[PDB]
Amino acid sequence: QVQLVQSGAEVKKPGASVKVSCRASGYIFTSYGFSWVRQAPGQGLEWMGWISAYNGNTDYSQKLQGRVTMTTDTSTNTVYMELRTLQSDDTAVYYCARDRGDRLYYYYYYGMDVWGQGTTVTVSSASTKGPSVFPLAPSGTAALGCLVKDYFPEPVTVSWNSGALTSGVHTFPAVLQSSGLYSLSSVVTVPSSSLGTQTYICNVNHPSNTKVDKKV
Amino acid sequence: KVTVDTVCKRGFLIQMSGHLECKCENDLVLVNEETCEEKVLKCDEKTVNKPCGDFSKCSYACKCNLGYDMVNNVCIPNECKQVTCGNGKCILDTSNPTGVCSCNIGKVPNVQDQNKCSKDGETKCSLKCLKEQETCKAVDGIYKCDCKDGFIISICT
Amino acid sequence: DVVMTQSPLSLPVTLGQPASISCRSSQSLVYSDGNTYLNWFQQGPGQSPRRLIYKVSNRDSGVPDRFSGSGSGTDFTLKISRVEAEDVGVYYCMQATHWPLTFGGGTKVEIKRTVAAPSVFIFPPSDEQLKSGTASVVCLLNNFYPREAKVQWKVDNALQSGNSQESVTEQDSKDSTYSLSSTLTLSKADYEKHKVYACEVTHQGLSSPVTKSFNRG
């Protein structure tokens, strides 16, 4: 089944280190190697390095050579990845991938065939904080919504009228502010002059439960 | 016929689910089933009949030997032209007077899948690793001779 | 390092129609053994990449027949005979011929539909937020196509820069449109020092730029 299971999401402070595991199963662990690929938010894949579970041959990307450390555990099927001096741009989703065992010769195996579920790593100096919810009041179709600002970490879940209002609902992807906190918006389109009596609540759930009336 | 007693000239033996073959070292190419030599880049009068690739030698052109065809810039046996094996390689059946699939270590031809390399199966290593401090080790779906658990690399140490 | 260039960056396709993605390498991908080693990966939204094509034109196990790879040397093409709904996502090409491995920039497959002008709405900051010393103004672009759209904040006819974040929703499964949100954040004192706050929108659906503005009071 050659399955790869990665560890849960991690949150670290700038300058700290993080260790990510990836448990291999379904094949002979010591017969192949691993490669780690990260993916910045909204960006493409980036090769980080490669390590051999067969001969211990490690190899890092020259652009990120001074802060990556890879190890393998033969006793318990697991490949580890340690990233030092966690900068702000290190925030990305990290993937596990099975690669070749020897980098010198090539046989009838072709690596990067199986990928792990991925693990999310967020590097920020922020602490856990609940969001602030402000209404976006409107002024024959009108639009309204709520602003979900200054919440760390991600994510939040937003429904409208406890899920009874779903048509025309748009919850935007969160953005990382300059302050290190996240911000998100959720909007909905309703009939302008035909909805002057309906009550619309933000109904936001995080350690924070908040529903705010958003009238005119 | 490459066997467990074959000594690959300028190469080393590797084993798959159904055969053994010689893997050339460095940038050498197969001139026969058990001899590796360096390949020439161009074909002219001085390099005529000289090897330009695996089972191919140098109006000058690089042509495969008898029984082989150019498929994706590689010479493969003629009976393996239309054969896809997935986790393995197509070889000639030594027991048939036909292209069959030899699979990577860990896979075996699946009788329930037209003998494709889609069945989990074990393969006993038959390699005679002559060099001291060496044994048969598995890597990248093949068996090959490599240093034991307490040696590495001129000679294993 | 080998440079992998995919084209186009975004590929609008119609369901049931063929599609092809280009991938070009900075150097020849023919390896020392005569093989090429050009893999194709598919990455669904919020999912891990899965390798559809391995080596040259070989399909991995479980990949439908509609996917096919071709090409040689430095030019390659991934063709889809009949696009299905689950084929939306980003497609990467990767080389293993030369060390180290390098991926392509990616190609986002989207659903093609008719051009729709965005509905532009502006929202001034709330009184609750102004009581804390920060002012956030939101500009909404709703249900438009294509995805590309330019938004510029203007405060007293002064263009803002570095103080406006943006985010775009994924392509809706219902109407195949997009929506954009832009948040302009300024200090209370800076917000109280100006009067008119405007949001300018440029898009194909608009023959002229659309400006939505409000007064501070």
Residue numbers in the entry:
A (entry chain B): 1 to 52, 52A, 53 to 82, 82A, 82B, 82C, 83 to 100, 100A, ...
B (entry chain E): 2 to 59, 68 to 106, 109 to 164, 169 to 172
C (entry chain A): 1 to 27, 27A, 27B, 27C, 27D, 27E, 28 to 212
Quote from the publication.
The TBV candidate antigen Pfs25, which has been tested extensively in human trials, is a glycosylphosphatidylinositol-linked protein expressed on the surface of ookinetes. Pfs25 is important for ookinete survival in the protease-rich mosquito midgut, assists with penetration of the mosquito epithelium, and aids maturation of ookinetes into oocysts. Comparison of the structures of Pfs25 in each complex to the previously determined Pvs25 structure 13 showed that Pfs25 adopts a similar overall structure as Pvs25, in which four distinct EGF-like domains assume a triangular arrangement and disulfide-bonding patterns are conserved. We delineate the atomic structure of Pfs25 as recognized by six mAbs covering two distinct regions defining functionally important epitopes.
We obtained the structures of four site 1a antibodies, 1190, 1262, 1269, and 1276, in complex with Pfs25 to 2.4, 2.7, 2.5, and 2.2 Å resolution, respectively; and two site 2 antibodies, 1245 and 1260, in complex with Pfs25 to 1.9 and 3.3 Å resolution, respectively. Site 2 mAbs 1245 (plasmablast-derived from Kymouse F-87-3G) and 1260 (memory B cell-derived from Kymouse F-87-3b) are examples of convergent selection in two different Kymice, and share 84 and 96% sequence identity in the variable regions of their H- and L-chains, respectively. Interestingly, our crystal structures reveal that none of the differing amino acids contact Pfs25 with their sidechains. Therefore, 1245 and 1260 bind to Pfs25 very similarly, adopt a similar angle of approach to one another, and importantly, contact all four EGF-like domains. 1245 and 1260 demonstrated a smaller interaction site compared to site 1a mAbs, with BSAs of 803.1 Å2 and 847.6 Å2, respectively. The smaller interface likely contributed to their lower binding affinities. Their interactions with Pfs25 were predominantly mediated by their HCDR3, which contributed eight out of the total 14 H-bond partners for 1245, and seven out of the total 12 H-bond partners for 1260. Notably, the LCDR3 of these antibodies did not contact Pfs25. In contrast and somewhat surprisingly, site 2 mAbs 1245 and 1260 apparently displayed no SHM that led to additional contacts with Pfs25.
